[PDB]
Design a protein around this ligand. Structure first.
Ligand code: ATP
Ligand code: ATP
Ligand code: ATP
Ligand code: MG
Ligand code: MG
Ligand code: MG
Lengths: 352, 349, 353
């Protein structure tokens, strides 16, 4: 009975927003799909299958990780990551099932069926399914249609309540092109709205995928790649993803510096402060093609190197406060510098 | 709810902001794209254009600006293939890849991959004159139904694509008949002015007659492309008229505006020019080579000595320049640059 | 019994004459061969092979598409349309039968053989067979002989019940010239019978191609192009297509204007109406060499562009009706047609574009 109050007081959409920012249309559709599971309007005879498409770096595995953290407490037993990049050969179906009878290796058992029987409510993610050979997809079509497995010993494993996600990268640049095209049309009409001063109607930058772009472009490509129409017809949910916008990327820079300041405060009580020009230069030091990995390890390289060289020669006492500021030589146009806030509010420089 | 943009700033304005003197061609392609975007065009067959004109008249840039209008500065929506590579019969393999059992089979076809990644992409076949006629034979399916089949047997879809082919066939004939029609129009306007009923002159564009389109140009089109099938699949055969003097002035003004914009962005130097410099730059116009004949002649009378000025440090930042005609060469021909200083003093460079 | 009843109440000729207009000898000969196939009056060990010869933009590809749509309601599976422009070189035979064992596409198999393996009663349309290399055409020797084909994995396939239709424009100019000459001769004889007061005989314009023109002109150019006097032997019929006359082109103009009226009504509730001068101005600028395709483009720029523009400035509300009217100032009789709104009180209002 308490699960209803925990659901209403703590909706998952806010928490999935607060872990991963951006992809608000994707967050909304996975929130609607998960909400249409537990309130009694669902299919028990079909396992819930999520098919996560999108580009790189922007976040699919972490989003599904937070989904499994939401539905299951433990991230070990209820959270299984099968790497379909490993399975690229015909006999790897044995790793799905087991050895044939009359042959050795049958005594070890089947790994996936043991994972699904030991943890029936677990969340299983398939990473890099594009390189999987077609026959392991066929042994997955057995689960994808029926949800029941038989191993070489003959034992029966039911997998309905388990939650299945496949993360793929087919037509990532294509969905990126449709997102960028609809965003370009939105920008070109929004500049007309600014010119006509039409501020009465609220403007949302939660731009979603168009309805007729996905059937014109993406569906014949997926029919050519997956080779089965029944695979594309049997899917419970397909979630498409979009490249990050401009202000959301500034929020991402703020988010990365936010956990870096949180880690400094938790380890040695250090409070960081940042400027908008630092965020501008970091967005300049970002790569669109592989997403937020660029901004994550760029913030890891830029600011953490300077505080690490400060800690190596003990220029960072605990309990003080730091500011990061673009250097005045590079503020014309990039080198950034650290400044210590004194009790007299004097900006101490560094000589490392 | 983008149709309001189509009400406020159509294709004709965007093309006339980049392409001048081709108002008939702009009107034709704008009407066809307007018919396509309003849901008023059959989606069974793709829209096919064939631009015929003299060189340097703006056919390739009209195709490029058309692609910019559709896909908004996106690299994928503009599939450009130069057909000048496709001079032999086996070059068709470059479209579709090799058959099974052959080298390059797993790579697949190039145009097929580019049209699979974007089916509504604008495909520009540059220089369809320059390809072999048997290479154009593969265009029959792709223009009739947008149905191209791969090396591996997969079939792509091009039902909503826009194909634009540039050519130089009958360029001498088109240019000669256009200048002859402008000449007789000028003569008949002057003759009607002799009784003071000739201020109408003509329309802005020369209406190329259907009799001239069928009895003259079409035999050369049939003779070079060797096939009435390929000409039948072409939805709009769009003719480009050569420039007359009024838009030659505007064209020289556009080039000089670009070279004034090359400064002031990184040197803070302005460039100002009179009308007689525009007259003596229109004077060096070659009919055979088109606007490109102007485009690399303008610097020959404007920028090169200006380049020498940048080698002689005669242009600091903040100068005010003026290109005028030489007094001794007023034959009409060299030009000379001057700097006007803040106390209204002219210094000849 | 039920299929015989269905063929009795409406033959193939009525359905395809609805879908394709003109070409009466072509549809008659094709429907006769199909009727021989359907009623069990044919040698089952030989597949039925057609070569569609005629001008461009006449309807050969459309007629064979309509025939394959008549055979199966599912035209995705039982209609194998292979385009011969991909097959301009000899090694493109590897697209048909697949690669030999030991090469990159061997496990994929032959592309034609797998589609014929899915269904062996399919209509295979070899589009533009003039364009393929003749050594590629040498594989249709064993396709047309006993209806068998060997895959790259050694598994032969049977195609005894399949129907193979090729289309080409070999001798397009000769067929069009001879058909125009025969039309001129028939019109001369008709006006002579009018001048001789002979009009009691119903002489329809079903012009037939003589055997002497087939054997004198079409056969040497066919043997010069296909370069083998054994490929043409296995072709069961040479179906002949003719350029349109005036009334057929008028019916084509009315057909496409009916199509645009149907689209306007079913998408935006717009009723269209036109006069006979509309058909005259949509037939006058006709090119024979582009056939029906030329007529289509004449409907496209003269009328449909004005419809799209008049939609763009928002002059076409739901339920309104338009009349297409020839221009008075071009009564030049490229002209122009005007769109006139008819209101509730049957008044004519010209619309500005
Ligand atoms: N939008 C984001 N917000 C916050 N952190 C992010 C974001 N994107 C990536 N990260 C961080 O970077 C890591 C990258 O993992 P993530 O699952 O987000 O990437 P991905 O795009 O799914 O990866 P891959 O392309 O390899 O499938 C995350 O674990 C997280 O720490
Ligand atoms: N309408 C125009 N008027 C004047 N100059 C133009 C116009 N369009 C383009 N130009 C300029 O002239 C150059 C030549 O144009 P473009 O490359 O389109 O050639 P073209 O007319 O298609 O001829 P060709 O087919 O022989 O290449 C362009 O690079 C541009 O700088
Ligand atoms: N006789 C006709 N009756 C009705 N529609 C026709 C006719 N001929 C052509 N069409 C229309 O024009 C299109 C072109 O026809 P189709 O491709 O069959 O012509 P074709 O003469 O066989 O072609 P090709 O140029 O390859 O020889 C058809 O799909 C149809 O829409
Ligand atoms: Mg990931
Ligand atoms: Mg060019
Ligand atoms: Mg055809």
């Amino acid at each position: 009975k308490r699960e209803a109050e925990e659901r209403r007081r703590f909706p998952l959409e806010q928490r999935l927003k607060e872990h991963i920012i951006g992809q608000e249309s994707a967050i909304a559709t996975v929130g609607a799909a998960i909400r249409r599971k537990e309130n009694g309007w669902y299919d028990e005879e079909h396992p819930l299958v999520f098919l996560f498409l999108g580009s790189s770096g922007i976040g699919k595995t972490e989003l599904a990780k937070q989904t499994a953290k939401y539905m299951h407490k433990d991230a070990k037993k209820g959270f299984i990551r099968l790497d379909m990049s490993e399975f690229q050969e015909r006999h790897e179906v044995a790793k799905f099932i087991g050895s044939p009878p009359g042959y050795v290796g049958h005594e070890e058992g089947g790994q996936l069926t043991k994972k699904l029987k030991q943890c029936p409510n677990a969340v299983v993610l398939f990473d890099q399914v594009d390189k999987a050979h077609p026959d392991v997809l066929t042994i997955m079509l057995q689960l994808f249609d029926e949800g029941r497995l038989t191993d070489g010993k003959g034992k029966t494993i039911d997998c309905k309540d388990a939650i299945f996600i496949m993360t793929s990268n087919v037509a990532s640049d294509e969905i990126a092109q449709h997102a960028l095209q609809l965003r370009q049309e939105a920008l070109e009409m929004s500049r007309n709205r600014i010119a006509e001063n039409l501020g009465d109607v609220q403007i949302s930058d939660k731009i979603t995928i168009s309805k007729n772009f996905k059937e014109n472009v993406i569906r014949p490509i997926l029919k050519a790649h997956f080779r089965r129409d029944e695979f594309l017809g049997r899917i419970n949910e397909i979630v498409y993803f979009l490249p990050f916008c401009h202000s959301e990327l500034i929020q991402l820079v703020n988010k990365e510096l936010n956990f870096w300041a949180k880690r400094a405060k938790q380890r040695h009580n250090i409070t960081l402060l940042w400027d908008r020009e630092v965020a501008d230069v970091l967005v300049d030091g970002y790569n669109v093609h592989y997403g937020a990995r660029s901004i994550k390890h760029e913030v890891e390289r830029r600011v953490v190197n300077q505080l690490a060289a400060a800690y190596e020669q003990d220029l960072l006492p605990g309990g003080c406060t730091l500011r990061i500021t673009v250097e005045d030589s590079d503020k014309q146009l990039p080198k950034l510098r650290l400044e210590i806030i004194d009790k007299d509010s004097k900006t101490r420089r560094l000589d490392i």
